[PDB]
Design a protein around this motif. Sequence first.
Motif, PDB file in Angstrom:
ATOM      1  N   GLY A  14      15.661  -7.768 -47.649  1.00  0.00           N
ATOM      2  CA  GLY A  14      16.082  -7.433 -48.925  1.00  0.00           C
ATOM      3  C   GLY A  14      17.689  -7.202 -49.089  1.00  0.00           C
ATOM      4  O   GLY A  14      18.184  -7.231 -48.100  1.00  0.00           O
ATOM      5  N   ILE A  15      18.171  -7.108 -50.432  1.00  0.00           N
ATOM      6  CA  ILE A  15      19.401  -6.850 -50.656  1.00  0.00           C
ATOM      7  C   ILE A  15      20.205  -5.536 -49.924  1.00  0.00           C
ATOM      8  O   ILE A  15      21.252  -5.435 -49.488  1.00  0.00           O
ATOM      9  CB  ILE A  15      19.786  -7.089 -52.064  1.00  0.00           C
ATOM     10  CG1 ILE A  15      21.155  -7.212 -52.402  1.00  0.00           C
ATOM     11  CG2 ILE A  15      19.179  -5.656 -52.797  1.00  0.00           C
ATOM     12  CD1 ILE A  15      21.604  -7.660 -53.876  1.00  0.00           C
ATOM     13  N   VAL A  16      19.086  -4.469 -49.831  1.00  0.00           N
ATOM     14  CA  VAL A  16      19.704  -3.247 -48.997  1.00  0.00           C
ATOM     15  C   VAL A  16      19.085  -3.236 -47.827  1.00  0.00           C
ATOM     16  O   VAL A  16      19.738  -2.991 -46.636  1.00  0.00           O
ATOM     17  CB  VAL A  16      19.070  -2.202 -49.965  1.00  0.00           C
ATOM     18  CG1 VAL A  16      19.287  -0.780 -49.038  1.00  0.00           C
ATOM     19  CG2 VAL A  16      19.947  -1.996 -51.192  1.00  0.00           C
ATOM     20  N   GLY A  17      17.786  -3.715 -47.579  1.00  0.00           N
ATOM     21  CA  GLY A  17      17.069  -3.997 -46.231  1.00  0.00           C
ATOM     22  C   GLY A  17      18.102  -4.570 -45.279  1.00  0.00           C
ATOM     23  O   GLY A  17      18.160  -4.064 -44.205  1.00  0.00           O
ATOM     24  N   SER A  18      18.621  -5.824 -45.609  1.00  0.00           N
ATOM     25  CA  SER A  18      19.477  -6.573 -44.725  1.00  0.00           C
ATOM     26  C   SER A  18      20.770  -5.779 -44.461  1.00  0.00           C
ATOM     27  O   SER A  18      21.314  -5.988 -43.108  1.00  0.00           O
ATOM     28  CB  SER A  18      19.835  -7.769 -45.451  1.00  0.00           C
ATOM     29  OG  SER A  18      20.426  -7.703 -46.330  1.00  0.00           O
ATOM     30  N   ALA A 173      22.499   2.051 -58.393  1.00  0.00           N
ATOM     31  CA  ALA A 173      22.903   1.305 -59.687  1.00  0.00           C
ATOM     32  C   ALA A 173      22.538  -0.264 -59.341  1.00  0.00           C
ATOM     33  O   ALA A 173      22.261  -0.500 -58.116  1.00  0.00           O
ATOM     34  CB  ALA A 173      24.437   1.556 -59.812  1.00  0.00           C
ATOM     35  N   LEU A 174      23.028  -1.197 -59.999  1.00  0.00           N
ATOM     36  CA  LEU A 174      23.023  -2.590 -59.480  1.00  0.00           C
ATOM     37  C   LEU A 174      23.723  -2.995 -58.334  1.00  0.00           C
ATOM     38  O   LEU A 174      24.731  -2.431 -58.078  1.00  0.00           O
ATOM     39  CB  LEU A 174      23.788  -3.404 -60.680  1.00  0.00           C
ATOM     40  CG  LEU A 174      23.922  -4.707 -60.661  1.00  0.00           C
ATOM     41  CD1 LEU A 174      22.906  -5.636 -60.772  1.00  0.00           C
ATOM     42  CD2 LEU A 174      25.020  -5.224 -61.745  1.00  0.00           C
ATOM     43  N   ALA A 222      25.786  -2.693 -51.322  1.00  0.00           N
ATOM     44  CA  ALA A 222      24.572  -2.490 -50.099  1.00  0.00           C
ATOM     45  C   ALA A 222      24.905  -1.741 -49.205  1.00  0.00           C
ATOM     46  O   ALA A 222      23.899  -0.995 -48.617  1.00  0.00           O
ATOM     47  CB  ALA A 222      23.867  -3.992 -49.970  1.00  0.00           C
ATOM     48  N   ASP A 223      25.991  -1.750 -48.387  1.00  0.00           N
ATOM     49  CA  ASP A 223      26.387  -1.093 -47.285  1.00  0.00           C
ATOM     50  C   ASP A 223      26.550   0.205 -47.710  1.00  0.00           C
ATOM     51  O   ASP A 223      26.048   1.157 -46.935  1.00  0.00           O
ATOM     52  CB  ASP A 223      27.723  -1.669 -46.745  1.00  0.00           C
ATOM     53  CG  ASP A 223      27.814  -3.071 -45.961  1.00  0.00           C
ATOM     54  OD1 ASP A 223      26.459  -3.562 -45.930  1.00  0.00           O
ATOM     55  OD2 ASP A 223      28.630  -3.360 -45.892  1.00  0.00           O
ATOM     56  N   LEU A 224      27.134   0.641 -48.877  1.00  0.00           N
ATOM     57  CA  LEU A 224      27.071   2.144 -49.257  1.00  0.00           C
ATOM     58  C   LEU A 224      25.811   2.647 -49.718  1.00  0.00           C
ATOM     59  O   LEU A 224      25.589   3.737 -49.133  1.00  0.00           O
ATOM     60  CB  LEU A 224      28.146   2.265 -50.637  1.00  0.00           C
ATOM     61  CG  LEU A 224      28.218   3.606 -51.095  1.00  0.00           C
ATOM     62  CD1 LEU A 224      28.996   4.405 -50.116  1.00  0.00           C
ATOM     63  CD2 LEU A 224      29.173   3.545 -52.146  1.00  0.00           C
ATOM     64  N   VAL A 225      24.805   1.635 -50.055  1.00  0.00           N
ATOM     65  CA  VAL A 225      23.657   2.463 -50.331  1.00  0.00           C
ATOM     66  C   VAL A 225      23.143   2.695 -49.188  1.00  0.00           C
ATOM     67  O   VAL A 225      22.216   3.459 -48.746  1.00  0.00           O
ATOM     68  CB  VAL A 225      22.608   1.262 -50.920  1.00  0.00           C
ATOM     69  CG1 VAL A 225      21.099   2.007 -51.211  1.00  0.00           C
ATOM     70  CG2 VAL A 225      23.110   0.936 -52.378  1.00  0.00           C
ATOM     71  N   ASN A 246      26.138   4.899 -56.521  1.00  0.00           N
ATOM     72  CA  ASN A 246      26.910   4.008 -57.148  1.00  0.00           C
ATOM     73  C   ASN A 246      28.263   4.001 -56.290  1.00  0.00           C
ATOM     74  O   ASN A 246      28.552   4.871 -55.612  1.00  0.00           O
ATOM     75  CB  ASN A 246      26.911   3.883 -58.431  1.00  0.00           C
ATOM     76  CG  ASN A 246      27.990   5.115 -59.254  1.00  0.00           C
ATOM     77  OD1 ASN A 246      28.806   5.497 -58.531  1.00  0.00           O
ATOM     78  ND2 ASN A 246      27.437   5.771 -60.203  1.00  0.00           N
ATOM     79  N   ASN A 247      29.113   2.937 -56.546  1.00  0.00           N
ATOM     80  CA  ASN A 247      30.387   2.689 -56.032  1.00  0.00           C
ATOM     81  C   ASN A 247      31.552   3.886 -56.248  1.00  0.00           C
ATOM     82  O   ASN A 247      32.424   4.115 -55.456  1.00  0.00           O
ATOM     83  CB  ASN A 247      31.016   1.178 -56.024  1.00  0.00           C
ATOM     84  CG  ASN A 247      30.380   0.200 -55.445  1.00  0.00           C
ATOM     85  OD1 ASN A 247      29.721   0.514 -54.309  1.00  0.00           O
ATOM     86  ND2 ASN A 247      30.489  -0.919 -55.653  1.00  0.00           N
TER      87      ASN A 247
END
Lengths: 361, 361
Positions: A14-18, A173-174, A222-225, A246-247
């Motif tokens: 996924g977008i965060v998983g990866s 967030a997005l 994504a890295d911040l999440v 969020n950023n």
Amino acid sequence: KSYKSVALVVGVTGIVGSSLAEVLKLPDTPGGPWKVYGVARRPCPVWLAKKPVEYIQCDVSDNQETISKLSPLKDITHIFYVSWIGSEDCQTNATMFKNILNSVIPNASNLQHVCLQTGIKHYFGIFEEVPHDSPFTEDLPRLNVPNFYHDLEDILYEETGKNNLTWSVHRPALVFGFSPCSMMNIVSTLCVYATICKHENKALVYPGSKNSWNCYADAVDADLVAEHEIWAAVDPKAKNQVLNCNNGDVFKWKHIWKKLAEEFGIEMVGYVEGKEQVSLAELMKDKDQVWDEIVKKNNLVPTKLKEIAAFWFADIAFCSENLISSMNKSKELGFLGFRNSMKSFVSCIDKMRDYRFIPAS
Amino acid sequence: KSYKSVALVVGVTGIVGSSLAEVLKLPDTPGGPWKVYGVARRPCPVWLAKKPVEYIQCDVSDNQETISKLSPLKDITHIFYVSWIGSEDCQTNATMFKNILNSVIPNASNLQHVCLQTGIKHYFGIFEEVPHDSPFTEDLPRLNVPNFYHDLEDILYEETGKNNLTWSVHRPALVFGFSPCSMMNIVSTLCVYATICKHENKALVYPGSKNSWNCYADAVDADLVAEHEIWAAVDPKAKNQVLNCNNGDVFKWKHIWKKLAEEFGIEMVGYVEGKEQVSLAELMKDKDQVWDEIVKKNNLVPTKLKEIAAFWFADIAFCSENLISSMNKSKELGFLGFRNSMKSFVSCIDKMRDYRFIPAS
Ligand SMILES: NC(=O)c1ccc[n+]([C@@H]2O[C@H](COP(=O)([O-])OP(=O)(O)OC[C@H]3O[C@@H](n4cnc5c(N)ncnc54)[C@H](O)[C@@H]3O)[C@@H](O)[C@H]2O)c1
Ligand SMILES: NC(=O)c1ccc[n+]([C@@H]2O[C@H](COP(=O)([O-])OP(=O)(O)OC[C@H]3O[C@@H](n4cnc5c(N)ncnc54)[C@H](O)[C@@H]3O)[C@@H](O)[C@H]2O)c1
Ligand SMILES: C/C(C=O)=C\CC/C(C)=C/C=O
Ligand SMILES: C/C(C=O)=C\CC/C(C)=C/C=O
């Protein structure tokens, strides 16, 4: 090796998983050194086989399969649930998460924490068929909608309470991210659109609403999440909290649009007064072949158009406004990670070029 | 004592000047221990005589007076220019600042740094008679307007360059602060309005525009502006930079309005669809006597209405929108100070009650 922590990353493609798969393996990462098991639906794609993650293909909606694949994983210390089924069905999403917990909780004796990732939809509703006003804060009560997030939280609270595990809910967030296997990757989507505009000698024409062009918006890298999830997973001050991510800043799509044009060396057509939103999904209807041509021409990692892009989701982003969320709670708890959203956007672009998902320039 | 640093705070009775007077004297403050000279126009008011600042009454627009009062101040290491003349006159504002520098630079041999405080008007124009789009970033070029900020910066760059001093420009957002001697104190202003509404058994009725009610806004706490100025004054990474200063989040006046009502135990009347902005300055025309009664009734520090409140400025706040500024540059430089704006607002209220400028409740 022996490891300090062992992560189960459910949704590793996924977008965060990866991102977690990269972030958890850095030597400075809190709780490290980390072993990483990565679960996803499909066979390990090629890009992920070149990463130090133990990949487990598993349909986590199938209870027996999930038991047989995850029961043996006795060393797990931290679960990162960064997945959903790809529709808003409360029952099928709930099954995924329950299967994970029922498979791991009784077998992993040093399990400490479960991190659940949902999102800011919590605050405004679902994608089929009201909103709280913003900025969104974590204490806002549930809307009266069948949001599968409510079921996931209820399961989280039940299972962790009765088993003395800690929990966190993350409401990003997005996401600005790089995975081409995501069902909701705004940056790859817009990158694909621009790549096509360029290939067909057209301008980068903005298809969205006036409001989305001009209103303040926010996002998360994504890295911040991943850092935020990792922080809540190891920092005892953060335990058992709901937390936005969020950023830390705001942007406007109009400024992003210009940078996107510049990054693809093409002309831009901004929002035009009085003109109204058209569906980018409709405009890109039958471009699958142009995309397959582009992939082959530039020797890209092969992706189907519908995989790498989610034009429907861009359309939603471009009729949205008033969705800013607050990071005050996380900051008051000590998390001071942030990103410059304009730079995060560019950095997603660069990285998707770097990994060869989209053409260089 | 001997001190590590010696500050000249020009505008010590101001909304930021008065915070610097507190912040610079805290034992943990970078560059400390600090001696503090405080310049302002009027005789030392009573509240300030109970502070460890060497107060200098001086009309800094009068060159000879300024020379005679500041020439002898040989120990000064850091100037904090946190003043303006109270109108937008480029010449009279410029004279103030030039007088300060011409009086101190040749006499203070260990002078290191000059901090100049301007503001986000830099980005959108002046209060008499275009704007950049936001979020405002520091690299945005000057507007073609006679903004006295341009003259102050030009003087700053000239005088510091030719004398090997470092400089910083600070462009705060709207300030949440406590001084009753400010010409632009939004919180005291709204506090006075509510105090009057309460005393006359009326509701806290919102007089502003629809947009200002609903749009995202930002602000800065006076103490955070002081920390940010102090940071740029001592941290070598921050030297010779233009830098915005806001609380790091966003709010809406509508949510602030509700909290204001709650803090004064009175009913609120929000924005009413279709209804239009009325001038709070006009509504409060001849309330000077009601205020003088209230001051005496509650044994407040005596203030004239026109001193403690600036209803004209509230009117401007309430027809404004699209003024968000970015803190990315400061954060990328390492400054991670922030405040929760809703809490900062309440904390200004509490402090003005604490210092007896407005009635307790
Ligand atoms: N993408 C965004 O911008 C965004 C923003 C805010 C919140 N969120 C939320 O984050 C959560 C996770 O979404 P995402 O966008 O990170 O997802 P994604 O689409 O990027 O990744 C989904 C992952 O889950 C896996 N998966 C799906 N079905 C599966 C099954 N049956 N068995 C095993 N694996 C399966 C996929 O293979 C993939 O690795 C969702 O609630 C989403 O709404 C996403
Ligand atoms: N108040 C705000 O919300 C705000 C917001 C953003 C930027 N700013 C900017 O900050 C700068 C400083 O403004 P402030 O609001 O901190 O001011 P203020 O009105 O709170 O304080 C003014 C100070 O300057 C002193 N002063 C005025 N004329 C003088 C003279 N002739 N000699 C000596 N002292 C004199 C006053 O006595 C007082 O101490 C201005 O450029 C202003 O536009 C203010
Ligand atoms: C559609 C949009 C536009 O900014 C933001 C929602 C982003 C996500 C995926 C929310 C999940 O809860
Ligand atoms: C009027 C307003 C409303 O938010 C913001 C401007 C605040 C200040 C004093 C700007 C100075 O440059």
